[PDB]
Design a protein around this ligand. Sequence first.
Ligand SMILES: O=c1cc(N2CCOCC2)oc2c(-c3ccc4c(c3)OCCO4)cccc12
Ligand code: NA
Length: 111
Amino acid sequence: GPMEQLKHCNGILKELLSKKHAAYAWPFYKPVDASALGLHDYHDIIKHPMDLSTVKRKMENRDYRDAQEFAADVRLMFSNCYKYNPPDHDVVAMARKLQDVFEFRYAKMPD
Ligand SMILES: O=c1cc(N2CCOCC2)oc2c(-c3ccc4c(c3)OCCO4)cccc12
Ligand code: NA
């Protein structure tokens, strides 16, 4: 059921935030600070910002009703990176590596 599947989602989230993946997960830890990064068009291009700290707060607050809602947010965060940047940027390479971790473990969710 949704609560058990959400436990698996919480496990995935913990893994994505763990030292194991820190070499490529770090960009996704906190909301993009567009002003600090000089990305003055970021919020014109990205209508729905997302990041792992926001996903974690939503999980902790029981905001996600099912695993599909959680996965849509995680995928939104990666898609924003693919949308904003040229495909050969290092931040996109990091997004792709972290998304592989996410998708392969999400595919192991119990029914
Ligand atoms: O979509 C993104 C676009 C960019 N950009 C900055 C780099 O150049 C390309 C444009 O950063 C993102 C970051 C990020 C966050 C903090 C950083 C960082 C990058 O880089 C070093 C300094 O701390 C995180 C998630 C998505 C993006
Ligand atoms: Na989805």
